[PDB]
Amino acid sequence: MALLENMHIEQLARRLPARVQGYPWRLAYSTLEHGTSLKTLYRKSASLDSPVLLVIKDMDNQIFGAYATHPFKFSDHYYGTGETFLYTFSPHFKVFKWSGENSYFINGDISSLELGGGGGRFGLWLDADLYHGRSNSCSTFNNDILSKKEDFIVQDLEVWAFD
């Protein structure tokens, strides 16, 4: 609603897996509304029992993020399944799905949150303030850089669930 226009919702809805098709979208976490901190993200994502949609709008107004099969949580380990993918609308809408090379889907930490893994790199990286973000090409999704540069700044960030 606030970060996405009808253009974004339709192109995203067409690439969501079958198990969430026709499930209404519930806003679970929002930087605009809840307090900008990875800690707060964890608290709102706690007691979520569904896959989530991560929506990032950076300081260049470009929109990208991820669909995750499980709520974001602090984890000793990588978790999630292969239905997880990354997406960007810059320079055009493109979805980077599981490549089958590894299973390093989601990794929650106290200092950072990252999706994708393998040999050090990652697909998406956010710091504890949900401020400095980073995006590289990773083996989990074989994505290109979701943002303009490798480094980006989070302007607004939303997490949507499918209760």
Author numbering: 21 to 183
From the paper:
Here, the current status of the fully automated ambient-temperature beamline VMXi at Diamond Light Source is described, and a highly efficient pipeline from protein sample to final multi-crystal data analysis and structure determination is shown. The VMXi beamline and its associated PXF within the Research Complex at Harwell offer a highly automated pipeline where researchers provide a suitable protein sample that is used for robotic crystallization, monitoring and subsequent in situ data collection from crystals in crystallization plates or in thin-film sample delivery systems. Here we present illustrative examples of data measured using VMXi from a variety of proteins comprising both conventional crystallographic standards and ‘real world’ user samples. Routine RT data collection provides a useful capability that is highly relevant to studying protein dynamics and ligand binding without the complication of cryo-cooling.
Plates were set up yielding crystal hits for the NCOA7 protein under the 96 screening conditions.
